[PDB]
Design a protein around this ligand. Sequence first.
Ligand SMILES: *[C@@H]1O[C@H](CO)[C@@H](O)[C@H](O)[C@H]1NC(C)=O
Length: 535
Amino acid sequence: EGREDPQLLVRVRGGQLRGIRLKAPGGPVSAFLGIPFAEPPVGSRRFMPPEPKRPWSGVLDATTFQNVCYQYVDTLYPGFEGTEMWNPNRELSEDCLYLNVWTPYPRPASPTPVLIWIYGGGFYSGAASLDVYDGRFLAQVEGAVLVSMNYRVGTFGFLALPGSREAPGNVGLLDQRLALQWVQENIAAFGGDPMSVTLFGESAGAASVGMHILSLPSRSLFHRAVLQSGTPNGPWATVSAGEARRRATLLARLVGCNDTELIACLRTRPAQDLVDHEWHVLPQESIFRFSFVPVVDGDFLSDTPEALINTGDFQDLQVLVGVVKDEGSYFLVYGVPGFSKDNESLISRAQFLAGVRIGVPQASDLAAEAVVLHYTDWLHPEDPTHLRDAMSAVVGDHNVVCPVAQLAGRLAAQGARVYAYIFEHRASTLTWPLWMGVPHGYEIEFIFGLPLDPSLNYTTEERIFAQRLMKYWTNFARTGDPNDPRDSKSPQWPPYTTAAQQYVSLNLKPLEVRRGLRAQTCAFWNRFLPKLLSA
Ligand SMILES: *[C@@H]1O[C@H](CO)[C@@H](O)[C@H](O)[C@H]1NC(C)=O
C-alpha cells in the first residue's frame, strides 16, 4: 500500500482486505467482495458443519465475487433471460463460502444499520453474486450496510443421515449462521452497527430467515426479520429426519454407495455426480418440491416449524412478510403438462386434475378432489382461462400464500410486530409471458433498486416506485416500522393483527390497506386440509 485509495483498506478478524470503489447512479460505493468466512468445506469436510476461516497474511483482494456453491444449473429454456438471471455467474466450486459487503463511500461516520441478504433457489441453487442482489443501490441511496453470503445448497448443503457425525444435516443453515457471526464480530470495521442487524431473503431465503428466528443460537445474531414469499413452515421448506435418511441413502445407492462408511463413500464422489442424481430422489412427481432441504433434526430445529411457531414466544420480534400476486405461475412450466412460456397455456379440465396431483403431491385422492372442488368455478367448470389461473393459484396458495398467512397469524397472536404486504406490480422489463402475471421472484429487482440504473430500461414511475420500496425496507431495518416518521401525507401501513388482518398493496399507486390474506381459501389449506389427513 501507499498508492491505493485509503478508503478501500479495511482490517477484519482474519486479516487485511482491499475492496473496490464502485459506480452507482448517484455516486460511488465501497464494495468488499469474496471475503472468506469459513474454511473451504472441501474434501473430508463435505457434508460437515463449517469451521471458521483461518487468518490469512497480506492484503486479501476483495474486488470480485467469489465462486458459486456447486449446484444444479437450469436448462429448461436455454438462452432465455427469464431463467438465466437466476443461474450461477461465477465458477461452480465446493470452495464457495465467501461473503460480500457494500457500504457508502466514504464509509459512514456514525454506526449504520446492517441488512443481511439470504438468497433463495429452493435450497438447491442460488448465489449472492447475481445482478438482482446488487447491494450498490441500497448502499448509495439509503446509506445502508449490506451483506450477503454464499451458503451450501443441494446435497453439499443439506444431505443428511440424522444422528450421524459425518452428515448431521442443516449445514447450509450453519454456513448462514457463521456469516451472521462474522457480521457481529467484523461489521463495525466497515461502519456497520452490529446492534442493528435485519435479515431479509426471498423464497428459500425467506424460509432461512424464519429458521434463524426459530433457532435459539441464531436469535442473538439479528434484531429484525423480513420474509419475502417464503416461510419455514409449509410443505417444501423442511423434511422429517426419516424422509432425509431415505433420500440420503437412495442418492447414495444411485452413485454406487453403517452411516460412516456410506458418507465416506459419498465423499469420494465428484461434485457433479451428486448434482446429476439430486432430482432422482423425490417420492412423487412434483413441482415446488426440492430434494435436500432443512431437516427437523431436534438440534438446529428442535421441533417442526409448525410446532415452533404455534407455541413460541415472539415478544420482542419485528417482522415484515409478504407475497407477490402470482406466486405459483412460474413453477407450472417446470413439470405440469399443458403449461409453457411460449403459449397462453390454456388447459382442459383433465390437465387441471392432473396438475393438482403434481402440485399437491402429498394429497390423497380425497384431498385432491377437495382441492379441485374448492378451486373449480362452478359457473364455468371447463373454461381454459380459469383452469389455467386456478392451477397457478393452487400452487401459489399451497406453497407460499397460505404458509405466509399462517406464519403472520401465529406470530401476531404471540406478541410479534408484523407488517404484511402483497406485491402487485409486473416489471415492464419482464420476459415471462403475460399470463404469469406478477411471478415469484420479481419484486426483488425493485427492493434492490435496479430500476435506478438508467441503463436497465425501466420506466420513470418504476424508478419512483423502487425508491418507495427501498424507503420501506430500510425504514423497517432502522426502526422496525416501514413508515416514515415525518411523512404523514402518504398513507400509513398498519401492522397485521388477528382481529383486523390488515396488509398493504405494493404497486405504482399509493398504499392501499386491505383486509384478510386470502382468508377463506387459507382456512381450507391451514385448518381443513391437515384434518383430511388425521383420517
Ligand atoms: C403450449 O405448449 C405445450 C408444450 O409445447 C403444449 O403441450 C400445450 O398443449 C400448448 N398449449 C396449446 C393448446 O397451445
